[PDB]
Amino acid sequence: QATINIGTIGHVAHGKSTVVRAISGVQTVRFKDELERNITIKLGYANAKIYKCQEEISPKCQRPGCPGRYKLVRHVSFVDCPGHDILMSTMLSGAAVMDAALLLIAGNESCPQPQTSEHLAAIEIMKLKHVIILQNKVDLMREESALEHQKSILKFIRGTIADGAPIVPISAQLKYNIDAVNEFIVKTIPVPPRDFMISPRLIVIRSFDVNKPGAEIEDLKGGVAGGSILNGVFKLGDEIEIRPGIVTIQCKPIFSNIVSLFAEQNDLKFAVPGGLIGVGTKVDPTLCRADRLVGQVVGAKGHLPNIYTDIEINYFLLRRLLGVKKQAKVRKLEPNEVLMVNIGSTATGARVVAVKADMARLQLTSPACTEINEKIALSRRIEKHWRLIGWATIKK
Amino acid sequence: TSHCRFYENKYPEIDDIVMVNVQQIAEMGAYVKLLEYDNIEGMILLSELSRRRIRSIQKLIRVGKNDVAVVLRVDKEKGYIDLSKRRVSSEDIIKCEEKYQKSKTVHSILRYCAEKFQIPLEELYKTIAWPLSRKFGHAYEAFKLSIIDETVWEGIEPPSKDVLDELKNYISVKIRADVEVSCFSYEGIDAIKDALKSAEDVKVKLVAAPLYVLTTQALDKQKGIEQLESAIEKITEVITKYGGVCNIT
């Protein structure tokens, strides 16, 4: 199945979807009539092939001269998030689901673009320094201007946790120069190991009913959860608890036996981790209605994640903020103020109980589940929409 | 072409009970046209209409409206024929009214047939009207039995078989419910299936996982009052035993 969760990052109206299309052919759709013209809310999904010519996009070597057929390397799946500074929660969720990143910078649009920088920062925070950098709108720029842009980018990427991350000049519309990108996908991104015995944990980003308009109820379908595994091969025929729960104010975890564990385009026996998977469960498709299973944790039955509202956070912050042009000073965190705490996939609205030296105690208005220590990206409301302040770990 | 006879005699032979409407009344009584032989007309006397002397203010409210009338006398070679409705019993009113409603609902099923297949109306009318109205009573309960017993169609021939098909075509309601299955469970699918397996066996359609459009058929329009309610009750029953939540509009 899908071997490595590779994410796509860039500015809004630059062409992440376009890039995906160029790579795979699989469309992110762009939907709900708002997003048909403009920008997606959900993650965009695509399945790209790597079968190398060693003597590729398709498993045949008729194209690159030598008739010695395309030698199977990998199959990779995309994690394409919204690159808008309003919808950052989704991006954050994607980030602690990904194994590696793909940057997208346009030629004619500037080098210190705010959103892109923010994305980069997020990636750095959430252990995602494996970034393949792509020059995108180069089918517009001069023989000198492009070079200048590249130089500027290089200059920028000197103090960042990205040091010598590779840059490729592609056209997402004209279909050129993606060979290099493909090569890098095997070269610069090795897949981090993901075993059998590391306790099975599924991180849900999407809720899906496949209940088509027109059918009869004597021919029914269950609930499908679109979520990623980063530990534990889920096999067909297992019982599950989804632990952030269902709301009564108290919450109670949801129990579902596996109908299917579906990856690629064809349903499989297994779901080997480091991939984003559509899990058919006996759970109602009415709870998989639109975007209900977003930021929920799934464990195999006989397991104890903990649903915390009162949290011990170890926090770290910036000197100067991101999301804006206008990079504003980080004023100190203020008590009993609504922050957004992004933990793996959750985007919970939290109130500050205490501020110490490097630790903070937080109240959650919506309960999140901590199994391990859990990776956090933090966010705040200063300029209406949510800006990225810093990062944390749950000290548990 | 337009309209024609009942039963192949030129006039309503003496002392039968027909229906008319009064056209105008000046001094003779009314110039009643016969509603069974439509284009023909007769008349009727002033003292014959009730016993009371009819006021002009009473005369105006009655014209155009139709009623029942027995026939006193008939010239066999003149259309100048009398009618009568003082000597009409109360039962005969309802009997001839039922016979004339029968007549109109067996005329309306052949009017458009003759005037849209474009043939002379009288010939196929009479080739139906000899055996079915001479054997027993005419075409209403003849044709209500003709669609289940097809020996009527082969007993006499029509000049064309397209009017046959249209007569077979003429004589031979949804209560909408947007029930909202707002479930948050694990055994909900089964419940839904169970619900389907009793409420559909009337027209049930899936819209999504929550919304369902079911258009329950009613016979008296008020007989689907006992159906929709029943369905609702079933729905209520269903979801308490499985784990989810169903809400009804």
Side-chain angles (χ1 to χ4, degrees), chain A residues 1-69 71-396, chain B:
Chain A
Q1 60 159 61
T3 46
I4 178 154
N5 264 321
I6 314 169
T8 323
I9 52 137
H11 197 63
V12 53
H14 264 215
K16 292 190 276 294
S17 296
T18 326
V19 149
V20 146
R21 175 211 79 118
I23 298 162
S24 56
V26 189
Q27 205 172 305
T28 63
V29 180
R30 269 169 272 98
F31 59 107
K32 277 162 190 165
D33 223 37
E34 261 186 296
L35 345 165
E36 286 251 292
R37 302 137 188 154
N38 308 293
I39 49 145
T40 43
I41 311 159
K42 285 183 177 193
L43 314 188
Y45 210 88
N47 278 293
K49 293 171 147 190
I50 314 155
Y51 319 123
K52 268 200 157 187
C53 181
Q54 296 170 60
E55 295 272 287
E56 217 180 331
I57 308 147
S58 60
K60 301 132 216 161
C61 267
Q62 287 278 295
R63 309 139 64 183
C66 298
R69 288 186 282 103
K71 302 167 190 181
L72 156 73
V73 184
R74 264 174 270 265
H75 186 82
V76 293
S77 64
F78 283 93
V79 203
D80 207 304
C81 302
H84 209 63
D85 65 81
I86 297 164
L87 278 154
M88 278 299 289
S89 56
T90 37
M91 160 63 205
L92 295 166
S93 175
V97 145
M98 282 156 61
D99 296 304
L102 308 166
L103 180 50
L104 275 160
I105 312 160
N108 61 81
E109 278 160 299
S110 58
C111 335
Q113 279 173 298
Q115 264 102 291
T116 53
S117 45
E118 184 181 54
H119 289 304
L120 200 78
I123 257 134
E124 273 171 46
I125 283 152
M126 310 188 96
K127 283 184 176 182
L128 283 158
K129 304 135 206 170
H130 295 288
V131 201
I132 300 168
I133 308 157
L134 318 170
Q135 228 163 77
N136 195 38
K137 287 179 176 180
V138 204
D139 59 300
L140 270 129
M141 286 296 260
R142 293 151 186 169
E143 292 190 304
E144 327 127 283
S145 292
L147 201 83
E148 284 144 38
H149 190 75
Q150 157 68 8
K151 300 314 153 190
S152 66
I153 285 158
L154 285 166
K155 199 168 184 179
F156 174 83
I157 304 161
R158 286 195 210 275
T160 57
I161 320 163
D163 292 300
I167 307 146
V168 197
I170 56 153
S171 58
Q173 212 73 76
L174 313 177
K175 274 193 174 187
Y176 279 116
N177 276 47
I178 334 161
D179 52 81
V181 188
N182 255 40
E183 205 158 40
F184 276 128
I185 300 158
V186 190
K187 280 183 166 183
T188 39
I189 304 166
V191 190
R194 221 135 257 112
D195 296 296
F196 291 85
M197 279 300 290
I198 315 157
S199 38
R201 288 166 188 113
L202 204 144
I203 299 153
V204 200
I205 326 152
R206 277 164 260 161
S207 66
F208 282 104
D209 63 86
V210 201
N211 290 45
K212 325 147 208 165
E216 277 194 322
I217 295 146
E218 258 164 35
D219 232 303
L220 257 178
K221 312 279 174 183
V224 171
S228 83
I229 317 175
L230 291 162
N231 48 345
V233 185
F234 256 108
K235 272 204 166 185
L236 265 168
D238 288 318
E239 298 85 279
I240 268 162
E241 72 267 302
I242 322 153
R243 259 210 167 245
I246 206 123
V247 197
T248 55
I249 309 150
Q250 280 170 252
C251 297
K252 287 191 174 180
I254 324 150
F255 312 106
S256 66
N257 190 55
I258 292 155
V259 166
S260 61
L261 272 143
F262 157 85
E264 223 286 295
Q265 279 185 298
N266 304 306
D267 299 66
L268 293 158
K269 251 209 161 188
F270 55 91
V272 164
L276 214 151
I277 292 136
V279 191
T281 42
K282 281 211 167 189
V283 125
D284 252 299
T286 58
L287 222 171
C288 299
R289 211 180 90 117
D291 276 300
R292 296 178 184 265
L293 263 153
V294 183
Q296 280 207 314
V297 310
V298 157
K301 208 170 182 175
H303 217 70
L304 295 159
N306 257 311
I307 338 154
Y308 295 113
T309 37
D310 284 292
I311 46 160
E312 302 176 61
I313 251 168
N314 177 30
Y315 82 100
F316 309 99
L317 296 169
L318 281 153
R319 336 145 192 179
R320 288 150 91 176
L321 268 128
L322 270 170
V324 220
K325 294 154 190 171
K326 252 217 157 185
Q327 276 163 282
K329 165 206 157 190
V330 177
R331 280 212 221 177
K332 282 192 176 184
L333 285 156
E334 286 150 57
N336 283 302
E337 187 199 58
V338 185
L339 337 170
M340 189 170 73
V341 178
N342 270 255
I343 326 149
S345 55
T346 56
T348 55
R351 276 200 159 176
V352 193
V353 191
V355 177
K356 303 162 197 174
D358 72 319
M359 265 202 78
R361 296 180 161 274
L362 282 155
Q363 178 217 66
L364 296 176
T365 52
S366 49
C369 274
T370 320
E371 319 102 302
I372 350 148
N373 287 299
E374 280 203 309
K375 265 278 162 190
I376 296 143
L378 302 159
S379 28
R380 264 181 77 203
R381 266 198 75 170
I382 303 156
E383 287 170 281
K384 296 177 177 184
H385 3 263
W386 300 88
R387 274 98 177 93
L388 210 81
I389 38 145
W391 62 100
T393 41
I394 299 155
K395 268 190 163 183
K396 292 264 197 178
Chain B
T1 302
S2 179
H3 196 199
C4 64
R5 195 67 57 81
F6 271 184
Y7 64 108
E8 72 262 10
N9 52 353
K10 181 67 174 66
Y11 299 113
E13 192 180 1
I14 307 299
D15 198 1
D16 57 350
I17 292 95
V18 300
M19 284 186 68
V20 293
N21 54 1
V22 293
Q23 186 64 40
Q24 79 267 17
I25 303 168
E27 289 89 6
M28 302 190 185
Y31 291 166
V32 287
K33 69 182 76 173
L34 293 169
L35 265 62
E36 69 178 7
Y37 298 163
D38 200 6
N39 55 0
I40 205 169
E41 59 90 19
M43 59 170 282
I44 189 166
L45 281 307
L46 283 174
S47 180
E48 189 68 30
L49 273 73
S50 263
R51 183 81 275 278
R52 283 85 51 85
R53 182 174 60 85
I54 301 169
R55 302 289 183 183
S56 65
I57 192 168
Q58 183 63 252
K59 189 183 289 186
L60 188 62
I61 199 168
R62 296 175 70 186
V63 295
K65 290 183 180 179
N66 55 0
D67 53 353
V68 68
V70 71
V71 180
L72 288 177
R73 289 177 302 276
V74 160
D75 290 330
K76 188 179 177 181
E77 54 90 17
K78 296 300 291 181
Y80 293 149
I81 51 98
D82 289 326
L83 291 258
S84 173
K85 69 179 181 183
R86 184 177 181 270
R87 295 179 64 190
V88 171
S89 178
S90 178
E91 183 181 1
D92 297 331
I93 302 168
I94 290 97
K95 287 176 70 69
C96 186
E97 192 271 333
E98 193 269 331
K99 186 181 263 78
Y100 182 70
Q101 182 61 256
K102 180 180 288 290
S103 171
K104 293 299 291 294
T105 191
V106 302
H107 288 169
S108 62
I109 63 174
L110 297 177
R111 180 69 179 271
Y112 72 100
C113 294
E115 290 183 353
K116 291 181 186 294
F117 189 72
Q118 298 296 321
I119 52 171
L121 188 146
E122 66 273 17
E123 294 179 353
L124 74 163
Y125 181 81
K126 293 297 180 182
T127 200
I128 298 299
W130 289 294
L132 274 307
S133 180
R134 186 181 61 83
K135 182 72 179 296
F136 60 96
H138 64 277
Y140 181 74
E141 52 89 20
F143 288 166
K144 295 296 186 291
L145 296 175
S146 300
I147 49 94
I148 49 94
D149 194 0
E150 290 85 4
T151 185
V152 179
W153 293 97
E154 66 181 0
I156 194 64
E157 55 91 21
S160 68
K161 294 180 72 67
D162 196 4
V163 179
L164 178 144
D165 185 75
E166 293 178 354
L167 200 153
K168 289 182 172 68
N169 198 6
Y170 187 78
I171 57 172
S172 297
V173 191
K174 294 93 81 184
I175 306 166
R176 305 99 213 168
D178 310 66
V179 190
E180 304 147 316
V181 175
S182 294
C183 284
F184 304 117
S185 74
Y186 357 91
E187 289 104 64
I189 288 100
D190 321 326
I192 306 159
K193 283 175 178 177
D194 111 67
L196 191 284
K197 291 160 205 167
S198 51
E200 209 178 61
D201 287 298
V202 186
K203 302 105 162 191
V204 187
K205 309 104 183 189
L206 199 159
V207 180
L211 292 141
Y212 294 98
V213 169
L214 43 141
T215 56
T216 320
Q217 197 208 312
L219 217 291
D220 247 56
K221 297 141 198 175
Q222 63 170 113
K223 288 202 170 185
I225 298 174
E226 267 206 57
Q227 291 177 58
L228 216 201
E229 180 264 328
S230 289
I232 291 159
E233 288 220 307
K234 278 176 268 174
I235 262 92
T236 59
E237 289 149 40
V238 152
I239 220 61
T240 51
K241 296 161 188 181
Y242 287 82
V245 275
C246 292
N247 279 303
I248 326 97
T249 40

